[PDB]
Amino acid sequence: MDVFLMIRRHKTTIFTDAKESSTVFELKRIVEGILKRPPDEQRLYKDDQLLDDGKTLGECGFTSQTARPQAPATVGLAFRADDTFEAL
Amino acid sequence: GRRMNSKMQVYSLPKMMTLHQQCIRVLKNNIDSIFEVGGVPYSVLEPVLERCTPDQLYRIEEYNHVLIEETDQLWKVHCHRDFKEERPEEYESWREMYLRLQDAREQ
Amino acid sequence: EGPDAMYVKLISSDGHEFIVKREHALTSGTIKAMLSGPGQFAENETNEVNFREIPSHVLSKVCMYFTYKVRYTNSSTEIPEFPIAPEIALELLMAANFLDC
Amino acid sequence: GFVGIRFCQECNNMLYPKEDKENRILLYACRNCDYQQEADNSCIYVNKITHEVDELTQIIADVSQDPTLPRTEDHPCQKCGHKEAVFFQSHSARAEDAMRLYYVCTAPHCGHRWTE
Ligand SMILES: [Zn+2]
Ligand SMILES: [Zn+2]
């Protein structure tokens, strides 16, 4: 139906509207196409339950209540592979 | 051994509520929970103050003093609702005569 | 934020700014007067809204309600409401001044 | 519709219909005294059989304050546009045939009543 995930870096926050099945670095390519975040610039801190390594949205931790129009899923991010872990 | 128990008022919020409509209707369901509005004028606070009670207007006007001069017209809304058989005399704002009438009645 | 007219960035003079879809910000009455100023054709692509004194959670909720309402505009669903907290809604009434929705 | 009573002005009493053939018109002639009065409306007796469609004059608006009456938010007022209304039924013997909801606006000083 929809997807709603808070891509929150502190001072810079990205929004999501897509369907219920998507690749997780597809979203990174989407934000790369405008905000210019190359694939070095994502780390993907964990969601409520076990952020996915299999790289598809229809998996564990992701349900239909997370993608709620009423309510988000707020979590911090990091724009690095392994160099620094940056908050604020 | 749980007892099933529930009631329902039969019938027959399907409404396009935008930002200002949602804000005013949230305030129209929780009027009494306001401490101090800050610096909000009267025009944007028009509807919820109409659906309000004079004890709550008293609390707001003693918390949000600078608003009293723009609330007085609404007090006539209370006055013709409660003291309809009366007219103020010269140099009488509706708020202070309303509170005078309330204090006189309770005395 | 860039040249493409589908993402619009907006800042409340604080840290956590938010960038929302322009196609999900269509119902704004002030996007036709601020982003669409004296003229179209690359005034809208700037996406620099340097507004002030809106708390972070407040403008987060108002842009969520923007995309919420625009997706729910003319949509199959007609029932739903939105849960604005009673305290922040006070300053969100300030948003009722500016966003013109 | 229904035509009201006519009252004599001299002896403070009821008038009665009568047809004076001199002008061939209708006069309301009291029969305690000699007072006479020509009639604005020719209707003397009138009856309603299935003309009970208007239950709204029997409804007084005060029933908006009844704590036992049910309140709804899905039927807004036409006059003032208030969300709250009270809904009930017409409770006469001449309304056993219907279970139509009659609505009264809950807000003060409005008093608007409607159906459906
Ligand atoms: Zn007489
Ligand atoms: Zn009404």
Q: What is the DSSP string of A44-65?
A: ----SS---SS--SSSTT--TT
CA dihedral A54, A30, C62, C34 (to 10 degrees): 180
Q: Which residues of B18-48 are buried (b: 16+ CB within 10 A; e: fewer)?
A: bbbebbbbbbbeeeeebeebeebeeebbeeb
Which residue's structure tokens are 């899905």?
Answer: D74
Say whether residue A2 is in contact with chain C using an 8 A CB cutoff.
yes
Q: Distance between CA atoms of B39 and B7, rounded to whole angstroms?
A: 43
Distance B47 CA to ligand 2 centre (A): 14
For the domain with range A1-88, which CATH number is right: 3.30.360.10, 3.60.20.10, 3.50.50.60, 3.10.20.90? Answer: 3.10.20.90
Q: Distance between CA atoms of B27 and A55, rounded to whole angstroms?
A: 43
Chains in contact with chain B (at least 3 beta-carbon pairs closer than 8 A): C, D
Chains in contact with chain D (at least 3 beta-carbon pairs closer than 8 A): B
DSSP for C38-86 reads S--SSSTT----B--S--HHHHHHHHHHHHHHHHSTTSS---------H
Tokens of C82: 């939105």
Q: Distance between CA atoms of C89 and B25, rounded to whole angstroms?
A: 11
Task: Answer yes or no: do B51 and D107 touch at CB < 8 A.
Answer: yes
- Give SS3 for B45: coil
Chain B residues inside the 8 Å CB shell of C97: 44
Describe the strand order of the beta sheet including C7-10 as a list of residue ranges: A7-9, A12-14, C18-21, C7-10
Give bridge partners of residue D17 from the DSSP assignment: D28
Tokens of D98: 């219907």
Ligand nearest to the CA of D37: 1
For the domain with range D48-116, which CATH number is right: 2.20.25.10, 3.90.1010.10, 2.40.10.340, 1.10.3720.10? Answer: 2.20.25.10
Chain C residues inside the 8 Å CB shell of B16: 73, 78
Query: DSSP class of residue C34?
Result: I
Task: Answer yes or no: do D74 and B12 touch at CB < 8 A.
Answer: yes
Q: Distance between CA atoms of A62 and A21, rounded to whole angstroms?
A: 10
Boundaries of every domain in chain C: 6-101
Ligand nearest to the CA of D29: 1
State the span(s) of chain D assigned CATH 2.20.25.10: 48-116
CA dihedral B79, B81, B83, B86 (to 10 degrees): 70
- Give SS3 for C32: helix
User: Is position D43 annotated in a ligand binding site?
Assistant: no
- Measuring CA to CA, which residue among C19, C17, C11 is closest to residue C66? C19
Q: Distance between CA atoms of D38 and D110, rounded to whole angstroms?
A: 40
Chain B residues inside the 8 Å CB shell of C93: 23, 27, 37, 40, 44-45
Distance D64 CA to ligand 2 centre (A): 10
Interface of C with B in 17-46 (CB under 8 A): 27
User: Is position D11 annotated in a ligand binding site?
Assistant: yes
- Give SS3 for B64: coil
Q: Which residues of C1-31 are buried (b: 16+ CB within 10 A; e: fewer)?
A: beeeeebbbbbbeeebbbbbbbebbeebeeb
| Structure obtained using | cryo-EM
Q: Distance between CA atoms of A56 and A21, rounded to whole angstroms?
A: 7
Chain B residues inside the 8 Å CB shell of C65: 19, 22
This structure's resolution (angstroms)? 3.0
Say whether residue D115 is in contact with chain B using an 8 A CB cutoff.
no
Q: Which of C27, C91, C93 sits opposite B44 (nearest CB)?
A: C93
Would you say domain C6-101 falls under CATH 3.30.710.10? yes
Task: Answer yes or no: do C7 and A35 touch at CB < 8 A.
Answer: yes
How many CB contacts within 8 angstroms connect chain A with chain C? Answer: 46
Which chain C residue's Cα is nearest to A13? C18
Chain C residues inside the 8 Å CB shell of B33: 86
Distance B52 CA to ligand 2 centre (A): 15
